[PDB]
Amino acid sequence: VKYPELKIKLESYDSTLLDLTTKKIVEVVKGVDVKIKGPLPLPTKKEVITIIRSPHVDKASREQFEKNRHKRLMILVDVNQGAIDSLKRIKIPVGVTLRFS
Amino acid sequence: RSAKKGAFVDAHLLKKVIDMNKQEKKRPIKTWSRRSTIFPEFVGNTFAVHNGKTFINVYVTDDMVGHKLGEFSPTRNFKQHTAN
Amino acid sequence: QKVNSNGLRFGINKNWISRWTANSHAQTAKWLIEDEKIRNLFFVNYRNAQVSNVEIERTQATVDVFVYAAQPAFLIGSENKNIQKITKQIKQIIGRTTNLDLTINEIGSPMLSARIIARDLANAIEARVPLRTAMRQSLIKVLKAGANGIKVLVSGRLNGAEIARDKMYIEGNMPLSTLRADIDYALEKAQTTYGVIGVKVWINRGMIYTKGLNR
Amino acid sequence: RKNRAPKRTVLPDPVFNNTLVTRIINVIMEDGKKGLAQRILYGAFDLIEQRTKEKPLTVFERAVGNVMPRLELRVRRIAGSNYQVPTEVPQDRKIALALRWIAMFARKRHEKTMLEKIANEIIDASNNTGAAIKKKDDTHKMAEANKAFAHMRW
Amino acid sequence: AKKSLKVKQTRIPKFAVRAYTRCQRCGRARAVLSHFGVCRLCFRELAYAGAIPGVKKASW
Amino acid sequence: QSYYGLGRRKSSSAKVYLTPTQDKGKITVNRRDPSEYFPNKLVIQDMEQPLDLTDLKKNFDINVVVKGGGFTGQAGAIRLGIVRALLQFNPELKKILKSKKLTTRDKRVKERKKFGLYGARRAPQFTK
Amino acid sequence: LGIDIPNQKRIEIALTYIFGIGLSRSQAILKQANINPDKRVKDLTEEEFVAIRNVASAYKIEGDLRREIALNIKHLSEIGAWRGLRHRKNLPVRGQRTRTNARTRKGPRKTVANKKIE
RNA sequence: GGUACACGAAAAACCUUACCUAGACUUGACAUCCUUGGCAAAGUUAUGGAAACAUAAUGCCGAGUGACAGGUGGUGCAUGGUUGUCGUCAGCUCGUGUCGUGAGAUGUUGGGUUAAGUCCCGCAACGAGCGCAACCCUUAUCGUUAGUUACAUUGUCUAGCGAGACUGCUAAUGCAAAUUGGAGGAAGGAAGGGAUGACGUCAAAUCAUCAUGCCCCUUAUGUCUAGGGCUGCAAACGUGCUACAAUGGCCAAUACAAACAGUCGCCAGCUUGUAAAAGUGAGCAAAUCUGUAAAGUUGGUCUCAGUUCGGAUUGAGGGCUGCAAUUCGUCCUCAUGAAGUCGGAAUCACUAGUAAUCGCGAAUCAGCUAUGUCGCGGUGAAUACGUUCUCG
Lengths: 101, 84, 215, 154, 60, 128, 118
Known about the structure:
It is classed as translation. With 84 residues, chain B is of the alpha+beta class.
């Protein structure tokens, strides 16, 4: 037991990369750390932007682009340090970030 | 006067107005930045205020002591309402 | 009028050339302005190695650089000098204390990235090789590596004011609309004594299918 | 060269269990929202039944049946004058025109709450008080004047 | 006259009252948003290539 | 006894509960007043009509919670949820359930707005 | 005020267009001295109307506010300043366009010949 | 004109600002090299000044030398890149070879059949490629997954996967494409949408995304600071944006949030200013803390009216960030109640969530008379004979 409750938020800008990171971490922390829930997700905050195309004229001439986001959550009542010890051997792809809230 | 200040310290125009008042009120100086809001004691002066070409000796009107010198200076010259 | 479905192809059907996540909306601009200089310097400084692409990750002023090249031997060089020069240059360009780790990996049919293709085509155009034969050289460069169908265009100036004389190559299955197509499009702005010339290449990494999601 | 495209409508309203009431609610729908229009039409039917003491549904359907239109026009010119070809219009447009005329003539009074005047106009159109019945009569009469222009092909 | 804007980026704006957002390569001072720090034309053209992390052609 | 279905309409989700009873129909959602929480609509009485072509409306007390949308949004959501819970009772009445657009979710959401189109399809006018 | 004893409708409407009292202040006056916005009243008892006029004059007096507004316009116009020059041209001073906006100040559809010089 | 009208520019008291005036900067405001070092370039309040700038003190390191340094100034017929017109069209290009005496044709066309060169069939034809569909996301029913701060009358909820729907089957009917009916499925006929613009096309526009050959100025198209103008204005057109009103105005009880938005932003909550907001004070880097969802419901009034529509314009009092709110920022409290009571040609969006309507959030930001614009959400119509006038 290390932390009474660790809130790990997985924030990414793709569904596939976030799912890959979630599965990787949930499979590597098991066996060195116990009492961790599965892939618990969070509602996302994907946004859409629209940027003009023509240099000067026709403001209506724009292309639309997506700023996607996808989030998972883990609430670790029981935490072991070794959970992160192996995290550097299966190092997370940079498309996903882990926030310790 | 920012519609929120009746008596506020400008901290960079009070010196000039005080020095001018220290004779009787000697008006003409060379100060024309629109960062200088007038307040109590800023009652009567002429500044070489800028229009865009020249610094005419614009009188800071005593009718209102909050509206700044930029208002008092005519810094526009339109077509003089022509039909063209 | 002239668009390639590559922005949607890169990112939801493929990856980015510079991908990184962040929690703030302010350092993103600084990171995106900073990493482009490193990418451009690595591209221009190393063309004998034909550096296919560079991946940049930036998190909290922490910059990591990965390099994929068509001829990685020139990146290391003889007696392993160029590798040391590259390592020190990249370590210094990202910051005095910024961490850096690099690995050397190759890609199947190495000359399949449109970047080096366009760069070498421009070099051939301005390297005593006539325009038709430079076109053929670029076509061989993409083809002899092991790549699929080729689209090559050279627009701009012929040292004149006419716009109704040029040549262009299309060979094979290049759907401009298929999202899952694995197409690389690159452009080079070459400075000639009469203006700037745009050399554009669309090269198929392979007619990909059943792989429409990010990896 | 658009071909035939089907028309669409919505489900009836329980005040009458008919589609005409709901379509009137759709047409008179202000704020783009049908709750206010539904309330307006419910009060309209209440004021219809409390005036002249006659059942609202038969009154409303008689109004929409006597406002009933039977024509649409295809314009065409010869050299400097344009005349008309009367064409059979689908019944969807016929009932739509009837209901739209009812709705538009319902609110053309400025004296009180809209409830009394919409009720009065529905009553008038049912009792053939000329607000839109004259349009049907004129269409029927000019159906003996535009078929002459329909006959010759210029 | 790009050096005016360049040095104005380098020279300290005496207060936040000098509101302008620019890029180190882009000369325009309009729509160079703080999220990416680059011109709208630059951004859209490089987004046809899909290089910015989490930027793809929008489809809801 | 306690059934629990799902229902959606116009970015509105519903969690429904039905139980075979002998009440009058129990027309209420979120367990509050239908006078003001339910605005003037046609669903305010058409909620328990799908109970008529199924397990009698005297059964299946309406115990529903809502999430999101507008006064007709969660209304359609809860109606679909109640009929989904009805499906759990007698699927062999579905011959008159799917036909009335009850088991069917309309697959309909408000059309996404576009640049230049401040509404959904409306655009600037061209008067001289 | 003190003129125009109400008729044909309630009192919240009568005072909306008399200097110093508008819709909001008419509603406040109605809520203050028990004016009773009932089913329909045209003229209340004449024991409260004296107090009604007294509290309406408590709000800036119509004759007084007419002079106040006129003198404020004159003083903002008599000065030699930008606001004065915008005043004397019958054009908006809050900051507005006078090319096609600023209407009822530039007249309703006062279309003129817009001469173009190349 | 289509193919510039809330364009670039997604916000002007200094900049944004690209112009002008003034003061300043001078191998230079930017800079390099060059010599060479090690504690200062930075920085502060004065002070003349508007600060520029000279200024004194100060806290891994920076500087003089001359080559030269910076260019948004255009030349878009010099262009790259960029999009748009037709048009996301209904077709297009290319090779083999054949047919012509050459231009050229062929296929690629035509009958069936589609949004499509969709395919079949036939034909000197054979195929290769491009555009619409195609992966992609977005969308709905079910099953299922992990489990809080969800649900809890629980694996619902969220986000993850799969099944499922592909005229699929049956009957017509066509050698084929592909149409119709029933039912299954939630969703059936390219299951809703789009992504990408075929050949060109306007040497359209872009020298200014960045530039760019050319010229154009460099102790001066370079640069700092101060200010003003882009919101001037006899005015017009375009768009939104308030209206010309009882679905509307006022009063009173009164629901559902969302792409979701949020770190110095959302700010819970408390108090007060009838008001802009102030004082107090968490939490929220967000499933957590907010961000109210509103219109709509319920009843009463105004009971018809330049009008309980419209605060246009205008001003009195404060409010906001902001050094400072004046030209070139703004909000309410309050007041004038103009014009306009549906508008001449000329018109617009439209095939169900469409027109129509109402709220919310956001980049811009110091600020906003951005009302824009973007995005979301809610509620919720008609019509569509057919291209006949029609244009594409």
